Amino acid sequence: GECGSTSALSLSNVAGVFYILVGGLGLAMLVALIEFCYKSR
């Protein structure tokens, strides 16, 4: 046989939360600020 018959270390497999939720940060921030400038407007 030439094809045969552990301590995994995560690097970016979990990073997918970042470019989505972290984006949602500035999302809700911007939307909120729009609501505020509309209210004061």
Place this chain on the structure above:
Amino acid sequence: IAIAPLTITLVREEVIDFSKPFMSLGISIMIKKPQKSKPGVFSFLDPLAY
């Protein structure tokens, strides 16, 4: 006379005489010694990545 780390085999018995064995041995398996010293500083932040 021959005194040496000589293996006793039948073909060797069949031609000369061996005394009683003063040292009993067997086949051995020699491998390397992989040493992974436990880090002191970086082993703290070890698991995922810095």
